[PDB]
Amino acid sequence: QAIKIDYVKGILRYDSKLKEGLEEITITPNYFIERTVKGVDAKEFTEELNGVSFKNVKYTGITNSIINDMGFVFAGKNLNKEKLLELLYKLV
Numbered sequence: 366q367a368i369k370i371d372y373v374k375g376i377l378r379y380d381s382k383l384k385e386g387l388e389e390i391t392i393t394p395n396y397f398i399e400r401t402v403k404g405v406d407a408k409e410f411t412e413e414l415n416g417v418s419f420k421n422v423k424y425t426g427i428t429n430s431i432i433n434d435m436g437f438v439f440a441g442k443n444l445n446k447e448k449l450l451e452l453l454y455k456l457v
Contacts, residue, residue, distance in 0.1 A: 368443055375437035376402070384409055404431075 372393040379385070386408075389400045406422035439449060 366443055368445070368448060369441045371440045373437060373439055376431070376434055 372391065374391040375389070377388050377390055379388070382388075386405060387402050389402055391398045404424070404427045407420055408422065409418050409420045411418045437453070
């Protein structure tokens with residue numbers, strides 16, 4: 366027995382493109398796909414020692430979606446939450 370993954374899908378935010386916006390992706394052995402999402406924001410973020418530029422455009426129904434859309438779905442056999450967690454953390 367061993368873990369195995371069939372596909373994976375999610376909503377991502379990139380550090381370089383944080384100001385740019387957000388995307389939806391899927392990874393499957395045949396192909397990789399990136400798409401742009403429809404809820405746009407004029408977000409602009411900087412990191413001082415303790416100061417940051419706050420621009421957070423977030424709406425009612427859009428939040429009611431993305432409070433729970435945010436996160437990744439995994440399919441396969443013999444999954445285990447601890448291994449999945451440590452991999453996702455190890456990524457960044």
